[PDB]
Amino acid sequence: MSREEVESLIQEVLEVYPEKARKDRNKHLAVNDPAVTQSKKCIISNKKSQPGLMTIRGCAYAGSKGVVWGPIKDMIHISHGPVGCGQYSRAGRRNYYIGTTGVNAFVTMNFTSDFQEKDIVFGGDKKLAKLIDEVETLFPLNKGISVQSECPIGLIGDDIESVSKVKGAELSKTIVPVRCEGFRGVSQSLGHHIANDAVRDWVLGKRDEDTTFASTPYDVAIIGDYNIGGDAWSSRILLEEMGLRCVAQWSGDGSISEIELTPKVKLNLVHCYRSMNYISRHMEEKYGIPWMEYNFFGPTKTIESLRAIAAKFDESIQKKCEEVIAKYKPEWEAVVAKYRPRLEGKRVMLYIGGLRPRHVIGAYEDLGMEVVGTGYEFAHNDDYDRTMKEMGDSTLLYDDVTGYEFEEFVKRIKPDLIGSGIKEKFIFQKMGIPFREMHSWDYSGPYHGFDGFAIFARDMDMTLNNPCWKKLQAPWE
Amino acid sequence: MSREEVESLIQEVLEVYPEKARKDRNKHLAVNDPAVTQSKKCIISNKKSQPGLMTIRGCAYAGSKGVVWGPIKDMIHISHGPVGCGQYSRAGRRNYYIGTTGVNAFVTMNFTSDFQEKDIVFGGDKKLAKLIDEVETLFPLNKGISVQSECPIGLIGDDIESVSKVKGAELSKTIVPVRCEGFRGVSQSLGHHIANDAVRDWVLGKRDEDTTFASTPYDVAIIGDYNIGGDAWSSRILLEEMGLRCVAQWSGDGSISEIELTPKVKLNLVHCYRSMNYISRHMEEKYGIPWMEYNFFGPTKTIESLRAIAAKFDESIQKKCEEVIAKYKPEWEAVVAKYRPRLEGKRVMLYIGGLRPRHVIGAYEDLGMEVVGTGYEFAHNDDYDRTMKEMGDSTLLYDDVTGYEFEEFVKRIKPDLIGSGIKEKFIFQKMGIPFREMHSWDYSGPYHGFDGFAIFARDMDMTLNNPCWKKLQAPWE
Amino acid sequence: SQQVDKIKASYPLFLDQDYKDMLAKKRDGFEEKYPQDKIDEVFQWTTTKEYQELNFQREALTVNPAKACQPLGAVLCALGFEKTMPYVHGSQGCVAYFRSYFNRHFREPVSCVSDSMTEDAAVFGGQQNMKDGLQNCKATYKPDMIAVSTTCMAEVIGDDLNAFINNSKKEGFIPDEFPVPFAHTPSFVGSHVTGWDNMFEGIARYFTLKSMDDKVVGSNKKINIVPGFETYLGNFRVIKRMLSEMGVGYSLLSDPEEVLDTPADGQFRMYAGGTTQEEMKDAPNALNTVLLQPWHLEKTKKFVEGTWKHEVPKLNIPMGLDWTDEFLMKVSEISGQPIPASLTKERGRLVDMMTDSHTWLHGKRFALWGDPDFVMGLVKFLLELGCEPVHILCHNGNKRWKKAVDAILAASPYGKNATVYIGKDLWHLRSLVFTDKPDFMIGNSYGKFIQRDTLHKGKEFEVPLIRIGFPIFDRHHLHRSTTLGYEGAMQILTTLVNSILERLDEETRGMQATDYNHDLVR
Amino acid sequence: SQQVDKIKASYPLFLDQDYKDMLAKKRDGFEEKYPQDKIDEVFQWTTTKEYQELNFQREALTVNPAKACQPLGAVLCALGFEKTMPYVHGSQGCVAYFRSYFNRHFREPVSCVSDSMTEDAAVFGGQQNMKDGLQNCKATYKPDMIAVSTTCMAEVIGDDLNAFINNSKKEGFIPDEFPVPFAHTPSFVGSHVTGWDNMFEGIARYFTLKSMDDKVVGSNKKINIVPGFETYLGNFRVIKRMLSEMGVGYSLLSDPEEVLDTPADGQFRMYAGGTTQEEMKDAPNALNTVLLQPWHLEKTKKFVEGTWKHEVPKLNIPMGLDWTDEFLMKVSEISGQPIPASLTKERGRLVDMMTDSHTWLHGKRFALWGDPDFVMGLVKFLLELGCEPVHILCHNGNKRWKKAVDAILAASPYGKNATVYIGKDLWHLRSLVFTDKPDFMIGNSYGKFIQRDTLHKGKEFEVPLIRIGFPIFDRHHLHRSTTLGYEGAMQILTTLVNSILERLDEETRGMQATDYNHDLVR
Ligand code: ICS
Ligand code: ICS
Ligand SMILES: [Fe+3]
Ligand SMILES: [Fe+3]
């Protein structure tokens, strides 16, 4: 469907760049073909971003502190370095939790060492030790400390591992050093990798010798669900209604004890492959725990995932799964009947990065909506391997898209709706195109599971069919 | 001082008027002489206003509905006529009460007949009967209905007395017709008289044959205290601390049962002589109940009043009175020590119709403040007789002052502070003179009693020494 | 007892234990109060649908009305002309109430006089009161003009204003050249907006009726603007600003913005600004006359079309996006001035705020009340925002206005749940917000009591009040706001969205219970 | 479960019984949570004076700071110039954070680029990144100027911006005449306002240092205005409007109001408005230069006095009555233009509002925080209103500023109970509002958590928050407000008095318990 016109559009958009940038960016733009299984032959990913082209990517500190470690509610996370880093990431991500903030939970708080000139010149190891003592004095109910390194920590010669070991031995407390300096890697994905390495090396093996936890054949762990707006809770309710027991969830509303208990479960249910596959494979190799990916966006994927998960267990779990599906069928059928006629035929172009862009397509298709373009900030080739069969023919694929590129693509394709982050929202609202934040769910949700599908459909309807979009052109012009 | 200067000021102010208005207004302005105990030879009052001179006075409906009958919490007061009257009078007077509004209390509500053209042309007796039926339907916990007439009721020939009699006999309900049409009289004073007559005729004698109430030798009734900012509460506690029992409270936070129980008390304590002297004299004549005026403005007056009241009973009440005085002495002494240095020597002009300008002067002098001019919109000659001995020599007295007159007097005298109503407040704030709303206590208070004295001193200090009054002149003029 | 270092006013002084014991003793001893169980049962009954059915059968009783009487609006209209004293022929209690009522909401001095008619005037009429009052007012306060309205006393006794004023002039009480326009303003007809209309039509007739021979339409190259009963100074100011931005010659009529916003610099100014007599005299020479609030300016419209021969446009109140656009386009067509780029950018910025706040505004349910033009403009704007007006109440509305609002509602999918009520009071609205609960109320300060009642049923039933309209007595300086034009739409949108967000923060503040949704970013 | 007709988002969906049962089982089974009595005891302990003593002994740990890093302010300053791209040499995560943070505050697009330095640049430097980034940015986004700041990465590795940009020019990556001003903005020194000052000084030095020979002071008859780090558009508007009313020629420098307030009309405008390069080049020809926020414009002051030879006046931020009067008088003295009557009337109207609201404002106790100039202006205005600032916190304040604020407090009887803290964070302020409870807090959105904590102690201990400052994330369109001049003071006074009145209504809404003081009129 106009496959040649898409390639022509790619060439005209690339015309602006200088030769080196154009040659680099040409490999990150592709026209989808569902037949192709190896995405490397068409699109290149996980590369450094070209300087000065206004990328959307973050850093490794965002991927480690912001994404993986931050949702752990009962631990205190120290942004080690200058003040800006923790201030910009304080409570920006909606990883929900239950607790008494400042007493036993510390998710929305910003703990930092706040370096000055003297800390840069002479180092900050003694200051880190004094900070750990002060933390132990003022927050006695904390259950662990992580130290997230910012750029100067790596640049200057600080050695936080020795401080962590000495202070942890002194205080009988778990202190996890994370070398998540923002200049490492090319995006948040290296932050995920570093955070998972720290998890295996400092937390995951505390209870290897412990056998006081009572286990059941129906023990599962949610891995890579960060409870954005309550997503993990909406998934966990469906899992428990199926008869399973969810020992742990990583890492939204997560506790350090849940992480320590994870090696005792029978199955790992991985939601975000991209951020947690590392620890999932490590657990499979070390503990013999199988892991499987699942999708809870939209009723179709939810039912498929529930049936596949129940297939891993005995017949009673399968019967309970059938009961759950039959119980929830009328609700999502009513949601479809109410909202599909008002969204049928609409076209969407979504850039989120990570796992979400190919992972929410089924929900859009459940409402009769077509995804004509999709792309990632920091995905790898395996993510695109899944995406190509997830998307339709002659659609646009794009990795680490620039601001200019995405604006030109949106002008040419003219979608009815765009799903992306906070740094594109207002650009495209001024263009007159409805926009939905997909990282934060526009401060709404959850969208996972059957309960979340209703909210998703309501939100898409309310933004797409908003009467404000018919009023940008003044009547006199 | 300078009595001659004050008389010259009076003459120059009067020069503007036409001959008839000047001749009338000259009788209502005077220079005080404390030795003169006959104010009739010195000042004229309780006369009709001069047309077109922007008077401050209200109407008889305001004096009856707004002042006397309105505070009664368990009765429903129907403003009978067009819609304007009750709407402007709705909840504009801070007559405090305890109750559940709309269920058992109806003080802040506006019940009205809302006449249209057809009601004016054909009458409103049938409408009044249907209205009373609807009131009984929708407010079953009301304990009585009063019908306050507005101007057209008296102008068109409506017989509300017969409707009240018929409907009250039909429903076993107390229905009190009040002919308080605004065109009767010259001010709110005739409204007071009419309301007291209605109380005497329809409510007061309902329990004359009843003897089931147990009476004590220490039974008193507070008459003429309308609980502005909880003023009557702050008095009542003192009376209850002296050992007396307060059976009734006319009419702030009052109930119809208290009014009916009033003829069983041993003493009547009248606060406002102007609005309740009529019923006090009637009850002395009919029941042999003595009545006495008291004053709870400022520590000196309240101590004197408590001693005088206790002198009416036996020695135990006197002992309790001395105990109360001793208990409250340190608090008002501390108030004086804090606030007299801030207010010593300041001069005040007052203009409130009725008892408050004479009553407040003792509280003002307790803080070392001099009252240099005072006046009442509706006071009779008996009120002025009481006033002349309480004011200093060669001070200004003025009855039913016009806006022009009061503005010129203020410009010449230049008081430090002015206490009047809401229709003078912004005029004199724009002139740069601190102003206190005496009728509403500037939405503050209470000012009665020992507890009220502290609030009074704090309010006077906060307004008189406000840093805003030093900033009306811009630096470049 | 008081602590001199921390003195308590009535709240929370009367929450002390001694006062509580006193009040309990008083209630138990002498009030004969109904048992609390019976009180609770009766309140619960009053929040039911059966009570609502009884309440809506009322024919004679009005409880908590949402309107005033004509002379208040007449006084407001008279205040809009230069050095004009509002003069009210009748009883002085009316003038006391009008002045107090305007003083509370404005927080500014209001000048108005009465001739103080009494029983004697009720028997023989008010000729002498009129003569002496006019003489005294002119001598004392020195106005350039005296505008005369009436109280219900004078209307019922049938005082002839024209004859009284003429007899005053022929007998030398006031000079024959002194302008004394008059209007009959009966309080048992219409409401305060009707009084504003009557007063304005009287003044315009007085200055133009007998001098129409030399008037040519469009000769002065201006447009007349008649605002109507208006209590937001920002509305006058934004009309003037938008007209000046387009380079349009205009003549605002009955504008009081200066006299109600005088500075505090050590002197009292009784008069300030206002439409001049020359402006009123030259008004028939304008290109056209625009009525900002046509649904209570019908008599003025009749006079302007029949006498001035101006073809008055059919414009709604310039509220919201579409109606402001229509008003500006009509002004441009009448005057021939193009709409400038500054207004286009202002419109775009309003649209930008709409797209920014739509996710929080969408689907919210509102009950609202006020005057007809204001109500219909607010309903139109709410429909533009994707909100749901559920209970629309106008106590002083009529049947034609109700059909117009129904037509507006039918043009949008968001008006499907709306019902319009005319001739209903705030007790009706209390029943409505109990039985069919909206998200918010929009109205004047009298709504606060309704909010209190809903909170008594429970926190989950409380309907917050948003103060837009007249009068507002329990907040300071909200009369400086704007509701007309793009600026007014921006202010209203900000108020609405931040009320929604403030309520959301209130509902999610409980630690470990609901604060999981206590988001930093909204 | 969901009902299709009334769908529930997270609140109150997760208040359902099944979700509560799920969460209870999760907590009791796998969270190993401390018992609720222990949690309550520790929380009560953190509200005590002993905990406060421990809290203020902190030396290494910072909890909940109230400041950001320099490049954020550098980007804000760069955005104020015509067709200028903010370019941040260093790591890209910094730029992502800056853009998202400004997007959440202003709800507008924020354009900024980086050269995306990685581990390779940590040992070889960022020359190649600078060359390629400048070439790419100029080719793609077509700026007229590129303003370069630094992240802490580049600052630690000691990248030489001047050499890098010169080498980029001499090897043909960018034209030699293309303006590329630069500034070193180390995040471990100062805060975001320091970054603004550094960026502005770099731009001014780039455009004026090498062309001072032909410059004559006062030849263009204008006054330069330097606003500093400012996040209220209304402040720029009010400064320009006041200067235009006086008829005073002026040249605002680094003003971003247009690019942060572009309309939604169907196109995206990356650039709009801003200070032109010609204005910056002609700035030394002005009569004088006024610094609106002198306490974070120290380096700019040194440059302007040393190089441009302007006698910069000693002026406070024009906040509140006295300081605005001093600013207006200084401008009149410099320019020779008398103060017009419109500004005199505006000042009088502000004074009138002060007199109207003084009874409700008097004696109220405020804790407050923010940037130094804004904090001191707010403290000055609060003293003018008769209010009592109790806890004054400025995380990025210094000792000289603290001495100045102490001098201001000692000049008023209302500053007797005030304490000024510098270098303290919002956890310190939480201890302060627990142990010495004020009536209200004034600050940015981060204060909401503090309010939540106090409400957890009790309703009688809750300290409401008033959102004035930067950033505000949980309300919409407050960035359009004004806090400068008589118009700015009017808005602040209205917000304060109405917050007080709204709290009072909340406290007296209880039926038959506290509603005796629920007055219609306030
Ligand atoms: S962790 Fe990843 S960018 Fe898998 S860094 Fe990012 S809360 Fe995205 S597409 Mo923000 S790999 Fe989670 C993500 Fe996906 S922060 Fe969230 S929405 S499913
Ligand atoms: S009743 Fe009278 S005008 Fe005696 S009509 Fe008036 S609540 Fe005044 S001086 Mo308002 S004779 Fe009471 C009065 Fe005094 S309403 Fe109050 S303050 S003590
Ligand atoms: Fe005022
Ligand atoms: Fe925006």
Domain annotation for chain C: domains and CATH numbers: 69-214 (3.40.50.1980), 215-319 (3.40.50.1980), 320-363+484-522 (1.20.89.10), 364-469 (3.40.50.1980)
Residue nearest to atom 16 of ligand 1 (CA): A439
Closest Cβ opposite residue D91 in set A151, A229, A240: A151
Resolution (A): 2.2
Write down the H helix ranges in A146-298: 151-155, 160-171, 189-202, 231-241, 256-261, 273-287
Q: Interface partners of A (3+ CB pairs, < 8 Å)?
A: C, D
Which residues on D lie below 8 Å from A407 (Cβ)?
268
Q: Which residues line ligand 2 (CB under 6 A)?
A: B 63, 67, 93, 188, 226, 228, 272, 274-275, 352-356, 439
Q: How many CB pairs under 8 A join B and D?
A: 75
Annotated active-site positions of B, please? 59, 62, 93, 192
Residue the block writes with tokens 């069969």 = A389
> Which of D50, D136, D142 best tests the A interface by mutation, with the highest count of A CBs <10 A?
D136
What would you measure as the largest C-alpha separation in chain B, in angstroms? 77
Question: Under a CB-based contact definition with an 8 Å cutoff, are residues B385 and B409 in contact?
Answer: no
Catalytic hit among D75, D77, D148, D152: D152
Instruction: State the DSSP H helix or E strand holding residue A101, giving kind and residue range, or none if neither.
Output: none
Gap from D336 CA to chain B (nearest CA, Å):
13
What distances in angstroms separate CA C38 from CA B255, C42, C45, one per listed residue?
Answer: 18, 6, 10
Which residues on C lie below 8 Å from B427 (Cβ)?
109, 268
Q: What is the DSSP string of D5-41?
A: TB--BHHHHTTSHHHHHHHHHHHHHHS-PPPHHHHHH
D132:A20 CB<8 A? yes
Three-state secondary-structure class, residue B116: coil
- Give the annotated binding-site residues of D for [8Fe-7S] cluster: 69, 94, 152, 187
Question: Dihedral, CA atoms, D369, D375, D381, D382, nearest 10 degrees?
Answer: 30
In terms of phi and psi (left: phi > 0; alpha: psi -120 to 50; beta: otherwise), the region of D107 is: left
What Rg do the C-alpha atoms of chain A give, in angstroms?
23
Quick one: tokens of B415?
A: 């008081």
Question: Under a CB-based contact definition with an 8 Å cutoff, are residues A64 and A194 in contact?
Answer: yes
Three-state secondary-structure class, residue A219: strand
Gap from D81 CA to chain C (nearest CA, Å):
20
Q: Nearest-CA neighbor of A215 among A175, A248, A251?
A: A248
Cβ-based burial of A210 (10 A; exposed 0-12, middle 13-18, buried ≥19): exposed
Tell me the CA–centroid distance for residue D244 and ligand 3, in Å. 27
Residue nearest to atom 17 of ligand 1 (CA): A439
Please, which contacts does C236-239 make with residues 24 or more away whose CB atoms are closer than 8 Å? C237/C482, C238/C482, C238/C484, C238/C485, C238/C487, C238/C488, C239/C292, C239/C484, C239/C485
Gap from B43 CA to chain D (nearest CA, Å):
35
Q: Work out the angle between the directed axes of helices C399-410 and C372-384 (0-180°, nearest 10).
A: 0
Quick one: tokens of B315?
A: 């020695």
Strand pairing partners for B373?
Answer: B349, B396
Three-state secondary-structure class, residue B401: coil
Distance CA A137, CA B350 (A): 62
Q: Does residue A353 line the site of ligand 1, with CB under 6 A?
A: yes
- Beta-carbon count within 10 A of C20 CB: 11
Q: What is the DSSP string of D488-509?
A: HHHHHHHHHHHHHHHHHHHHT-
Question: Under a CB-based contact definition with an 8 Å cutoff, are residues C301 and C315 in contact?
Answer: no
Distance CA A34, CA A30 (A): 12
Amino acid sitting at position A239: L
C115:B422 CB<8 A? no
A82:D69 CB<8 A? yes
| DSSP strand pairing (A29-31 vs A396-399) | antiparallel
Domains of chain B with bracketed CATH: 1-59+342-476 (3.40.50.1980), 60-202 (3.40.50.1980), 203-317 (3.40.50.1980)
Nearest residue in D to C512, CA atom: D456
Nearest residue in D to A115, CA atom: D188
> Which of A104, A471, A472 best tests the C interface by mutation, with the highest count of C CBs <10 A?
A471
D7:A454 CB<8 A? yes
Catalytic hit among C77, C95, C152, C238: C152
What distances in angstroms separate CA C185 from CA A41, C151, C196, C253, one per listed residue?
Answer: 87, 7, 9, 20
Distance CA B336, CA D234 (A): 47
Can you say whether the dihedral through the CA atoms of B46, B52, B56, B62 is positive or negative?
positive
Q: Does residue A60 line the site of ligand 1, with CB under 6 A?
A: no
- Give the contacts of B431 (CB within 8 A, at least 6 positions apart): B407, B410, B411, C266, C267, C268
Q: How was this structure determined?
A: cryo-EM
Cβ-based burial of A178 (10 A; exposed 0-12, middle 13-18, buried ≥19): buried
Instruction: State the DSSP H helix or E strand holding residue B176, giving kind and residue range, or none if neither.
Output: strand B175-178
Question: Is residue C387 annotated as part of the catalytic site, yes or no?
Answer: no
Chain D residues bordering chain B (beta-carbon distance below 8 Å): 321, 325, 328-329, 332, 339, 344, 347-348, 351-352, 354-356, 358-359, 362-363, 383-386, 412, 414, 511-512, 515-517, 519-522
- Give the contacts of A388 (CB within 8 A, at least 6 positions apart): A32, A33, A34, A36, A37, A39, A397
Quick one: tokens of D356?
A: 């109207």
- The minimum-distance atom of ligand 2 relative to the CA of B379 is 11
- Give the annotated binding-site residues of C for [8Fe-7S] cluster: 69, 94, 152, 187
Distance CA B173, CA B190 (A): 27
Backbone φ and ψ for C394, nearest 5 degrees, come out as -140, 105
Tell me the CA–centroid distance for residue C501 and ligand 2, in Å. 44
Quick one: tokens of A145?
A: 């400390």
Number of H helices, E strands in chain C: 21, 12
Q: How many CB pairs under 8 A join C and D?
A: 164
Closest Cβ opposite residue D329 in set B443, B444, B475: B475
| DSSP strand pairing (A76-80 vs A111-112) | parallel
B476:D325 CB<8 A? yes
> Which of D104, D240, D351, D477 best tests the C interface by mutation, with the highest count of C CBs <10 A?
D477
Which residues on B lie below 8 Å from D520 (Cβ)?
90-92, 108
- Order of strands across the sheet that contains D145-150: D113-114, D84-89, D145-150
Tell me the CA–centroid distance for residue B374 and ligand 2, in Å. 15
Nearest residue in D to B465, CA atom: D386
**b/e burial code for range A34-49 (CB count within 10 A of at least 16 → b):** eebeebeebbbbbebb
Cis peptide bond upstream of A251, omega within 30: yes
Question: Is residue D113 annotated as part of the catalytic site, yes or no?
Answer: no
Gap from A282 CA to chain D (nearest CA, Å):
22
